[PDB]
Design a protein around this ligand. Structure first.
Ligand SMILES: [Cl-]
Ligand SMILES: [Cl-]
Ligand SMILES: [Mg+2]
Ligand SMILES: [Mg+2]
Ligand SMILES: [Mg+2]
Ligand SMILES: [Mg+2]
Ligand SMILES: [Mg+2]
Ligand SMILES: [Mg+2]
Ligand SMILES: [Mg+2]
Ligand SMILES: [Mg+2]
Ligand SMILES: [Mg+2]
Ligand code: NA
Ligand code: NA
Ligand code: NA
Ligand code: NA
Ligand code: NA
Ligand code: NA
Lengths: 154, 186, 95, 156, 140
RNA sequence: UUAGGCGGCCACAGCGGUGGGGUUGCCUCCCGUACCCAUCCCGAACACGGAAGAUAAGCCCACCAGCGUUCCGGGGAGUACUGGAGUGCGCGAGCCUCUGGGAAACCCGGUUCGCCGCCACC
RNA sequence: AGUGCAAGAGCAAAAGAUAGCUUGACAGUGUUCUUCCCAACGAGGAACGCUGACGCGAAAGCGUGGUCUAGCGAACCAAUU
RNA sequence: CCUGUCAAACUCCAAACUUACAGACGCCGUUUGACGCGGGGAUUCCGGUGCGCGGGGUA
């Protein structure tokens, strides 16, 4: 399970690429989704590779973000442990996070919006003109790599 | 053989055994084929159907297993052919086969030929086959009359020991007669 | 194109590789299909008749009745529904 | 006319003589020079390596070749060495000599397409590299920058 | 092994390659059976432009008709060697050709399952000279 | 399948070459032209009638890789080329990096001297 | 190689050659594709059927002209069945 | 035998890629009726630029 974060806008990006991000529930810059590592999902993120940031986040990080940026399928309601417990199969955020990571369920299955609309990265990100291996913020990241980004946009 | 571009004919064309252009016209009818084949000493008659991995033979008759019914004469002649035809025709019927077309392979459509004899026999057995009566032998030759008369010009037995000296087109009737009722494997 | 006949630019798709050259096996020209089957359309360079317009080589349609020995296969050209008159010789079972 | 007009490999390959007529004959005199009776049985083997893919008109091939071999007469008219220009001008070139109307030009020449890093010239010498000099003069008359490379020769 | 390996005469073709005939008659008597026309191919300067056109005849003799003929033909010939085929044949003379081969030749002449004869089972020039020479005459 | 008939795939089956096999049975060569039939001339062939002889052909069986073919290892080669991205480089031609794909020739070593189906059959 | 003619393509117990026989280059009416990719548009073209009448072949079958893709033409008026 | 080179109208080979159909996941539609069908009204048929691939042209 990888965390997907659109870092580049729609203007000028191929339509078949945009449609893919839209198929992955991301319709704005900085919006983030959690995607299982399957052949079918793998092909999709590869096509989206140049306009996004992805990787496998740590239990903790996912937890911080879930708590800070998760939302109900509809409404303002904060998704805190109580919410998770009184609305999901799990007892608390950590419970959910673990399940997500182990790809046992998904944000929809648990009545949650498939998108974690994050905040602009605090301190700024490494650039949308180069990939990670180059000092950029594009492409696959380290678990420690993705964690910093996700955390900075907490 | 020569190079990558060389064209090797189909195996059954190399072996000079199957005429594929005729085969295709044959398969067009969508009916079973009445395979009429010969050998220096024998005559075979098969009813073939089309199959996923090749042809399927649903009924056959060989001039050799003819004696099995009381044949005591040679097996590479006209009377032999007819009978083998009738025998396979009958086994065919038993197999639920009702119609077929005459495949005479690489043989020639010569009038009164054994292949047409085989065709006449299969027909009489009850099989429905598209044919042409006046391309067939005149019954007597089918019986083996041409050979009995040939032995009339005797001086020396036409048959080395075998059976009879003056041969028997009658032995032919006795057998056809036999085949037209009861008996095993029919 | 410089011309607009049906064989325009069909040099490749209507030619056999040197080794598949010459009359084709009769097994496949007699194959029987049932209404509803999915069949791949490909012209046999070696088989003259029963052909369909070269543009449809590659299509995978649905057998829906026949006309004579030839089959009537429904396809969809871009967004248009069409019916193609083709013989077994130029059809293959999908899967 | 200037090399500027034909030195790039931007056009389609045009070489089918069965569809092209009136192609000018090549100005390249020979491809094999020196002792062509003998086979490459020499200690040293230097080569002239083009450093960028380019088109070289038979014009420049001949001037480059002549300037090199004509110089290799620092060894003598029947000296002990063998020189080879391995490329041949296959690429037919036109010129549009009406303005841009019906502009497909008319064959005016031929050039050889050389890819960066191929060797256009190969000489064979005994420890007597006057050839290295025959090439400083050769790449002097061909568009690209070039690399004078020595192969069998650890006799430095 | 032998018996089925020993040579034999298969057809003797006697043909008169004229250039436009009355000659059939003599071929008829010299052999004993009707001659066959010899059409020609290609249009040529020897006022021989006609494609289908009688320009000679031939006669293929088999069995006795062939021996009974060679029993006078051969005597009228001297030659031998070099003038022999690589398959053990030879032509001398009005032409008279003699095709020689061993017992299982039909295998290559029939319709069904036909097959080319193996080089080993072929007849060599030498094995040919022997056979004929051993039948009323001398080689070279 | 101790030798057969009809096939499917249509060279992995082609080309060439070696050894073995028929005492009654099968295929052949083979023997033979009164008949059906036959050669623009020939029972060569085609067709018909038949066993005195043979295992030399064919055919069946076992095997050989020199040529051709099929597939595989290792090398060539993650090379050539390429879908996506770049305020990376270069006067430019063009190149480079990240991401997803990925060859051909050729060399060396294996593989391949057909596989399979139906019927009939000491 | 040949297959009438461009070019590309098809074809070997043939689609080529030879022989013989025959007029299916037949009347009628359609289905489909093409013309016009997608996507509407006429004449024309092709493939594939059926009804009828025929040719050849033992027969399956083949023949809706020539192996395939060029060789074509509206209304009005005339002449013709 | 050896040795030196090529192809838009060459091919013993052969991608990336484009593409028909089917299944899966995704996304979407069944009060926002998708897919599709019928009808009304148009505008439009001077385009341009970057990037990739081009063809012509010294440019
Ligand atoms: Cl037979
Ligand atoms: Cl069509
Ligand atoms: Mg909401
Ligand atoms: Mg700030
Ligand atoms: Mg920045
Ligand atoms: Mg092309
Ligand atoms: Mg033997
Ligand atoms: Mg036609
Ligand atoms: Mg008018
Ligand atoms: Mg008129
Ligand atoms: Mg394309
Ligand atoms: Na074929
Ligand atoms: Na002008
Ligand atoms: Na220079
Ligand atoms: Na004549
Ligand atoms: Na043998
Ligand atoms: Na029309």
């Amino acid at each position: 399970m990888h965390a997907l974060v659109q870092l580049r806008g729609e203007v000028n990006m191929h339509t078949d690429i945009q449609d893919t991000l839209e198929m992955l529930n991301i319709h704005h810059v900085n919006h983030c989704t959690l995607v299982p590592e399957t052949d079918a999902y793998r092909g999709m993120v590869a096509k989206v590779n140049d306009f996004v940031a992805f990787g496998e986040p740590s239990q903790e990080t996912l937890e911080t973000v879930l708590a800070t940026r998760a939302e109900p399928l509809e409404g303002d309601a904060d998704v805190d442990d109580e919410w998770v417990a009184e609305h999901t199969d799990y007892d608390d955020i950590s419970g959910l996070a673990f399940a997500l990571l182990s790809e046992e369920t998904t944000l929809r299955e648990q009545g949650l919006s498939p998108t974690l609309r994050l905040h602009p990265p605090r301190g700024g990100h490494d650039g949308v003109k180069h990939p990670v291996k180059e000092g950029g913020q594009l492409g696959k990241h380290d678990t420690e790599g993705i964690d910093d980004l996700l955390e900075a946009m907490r | 053989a020569t190079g990558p571009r060389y064209k090797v004919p189909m195996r059954r064309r190399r072996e000079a055994r199957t005429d594929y252009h005729q085969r295709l016209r044959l398969l067009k009818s969508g009916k079973p084929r009445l395979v009429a084949r010969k050998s220096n000493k024998h005559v075979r008659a098969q009813l073939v159907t089309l199959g996923p991995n090749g042809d399927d033979t649903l009924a056959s008759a060989h001039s050799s297993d003819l004696a099995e019914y009381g044949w005591e004469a040679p097996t590479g002649n006209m009377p032999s052919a007819y009978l083998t035809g009738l025998l396979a025709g009958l086994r065919a019927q038993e197999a639920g086969v009702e119609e077929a077309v005459l495949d005479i392979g690489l043989n020639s459509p010569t009038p009164g030929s054994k292949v047409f004899a085989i065709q006449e026999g299969a027909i009489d057995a009850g099989l429905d086959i598209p044919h042409n009566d006046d391309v067939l032998a005149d019954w007597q030759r089918t019986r083996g009359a041409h050979i009995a008369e040939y032995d009339e010009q005797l001086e020396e037995p036409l048959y080395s020991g075998d059976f009879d000296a003056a041969d028997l087109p009658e032995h032919f009737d006795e057998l056809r007669e036999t085949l037209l009722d009861g008996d095993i494997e029919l | 194109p410089s011309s607009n006949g049906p064989l325009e630019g069909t040099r490749g798709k209507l030619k056999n590789k040197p080794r598949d050259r010459g009359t084709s096996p009769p097994q496949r020209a007699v194959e029987e299909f049932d209404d509803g089957e999915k069949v791949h359309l490909k012209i046999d360079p070696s088989v003259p008749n029963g052909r369909f317009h070269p543009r449809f080589d590659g299509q995978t349609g649905t057998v829906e009745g026949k006309q004579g020995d030839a089959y009537k296969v429904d396809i969809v050209d871009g967004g248009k529904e069409k019916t193609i008159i083709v013989t077994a010789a130029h059809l293959r079972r999908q899967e | 006319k200037p090399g500027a007009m034909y030195r790039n490999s931007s056009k389609p390959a045009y070489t089918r003589r069965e569809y092209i007529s009136g192609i000018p004959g090549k100005k390249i005199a020979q491809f094999d020079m020196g002792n062509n009776g003998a086979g490459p049985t020499y200690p040293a083997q230097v080569e002239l390596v083009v450093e960028k893919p380019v088109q070289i008109r038979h014009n420049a091939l001949e001037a480059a070749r002549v300037a090199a071999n004509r110089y290799v007469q620092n060894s003598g008219a029947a000296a002990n060495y063998k020189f080879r220009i391995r490329k041949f001008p296959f690429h037919v070139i036109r010129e549009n000599k009406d303005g841009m109307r019906a502009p497909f030009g008319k064959p005016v020449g031929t050039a050889a397409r050389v890819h960066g890093a191929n060797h256009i010239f190969i000489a064979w010498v005994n420890p007597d590299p006057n050839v290295e000099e025959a090439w400083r003069r050769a790449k002097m008359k061909v568009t690209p920058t070039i690399n004078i490379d020595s192969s069998p020769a650890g006799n430095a | 092994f032998h018996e089925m390996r020993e040579p034999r005469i298969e057809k003797v073709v006697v043909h008169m390659g004229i250039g436009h005939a009355n000659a059939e008659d003599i071929l008829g008597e010299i052999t004993g059976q009707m001659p066959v026309r010899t059409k020609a191919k290609r249009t040529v300067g020897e006022f021989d432009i006609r494609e289908g056109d009688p320009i000679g005849a031939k006669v293929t003799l088999r069995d006795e008709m062939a021996e009974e003929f060679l029993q006078t033909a051969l005597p009228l010939a001297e030659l031998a060697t070099s003038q022999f085929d690589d398959t053990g044949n030879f032509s001398f003379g009005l032409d008279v050709t003699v095709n020689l081969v061993r017992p299982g030749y039909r295998v290559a002449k029939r319709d069904k399952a036909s097959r080319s004869i193996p080089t080993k089972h072929r007849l060599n020039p030498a094995d040919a000279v022997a056979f004929i020479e051993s039948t009323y005459d001398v080689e070279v």
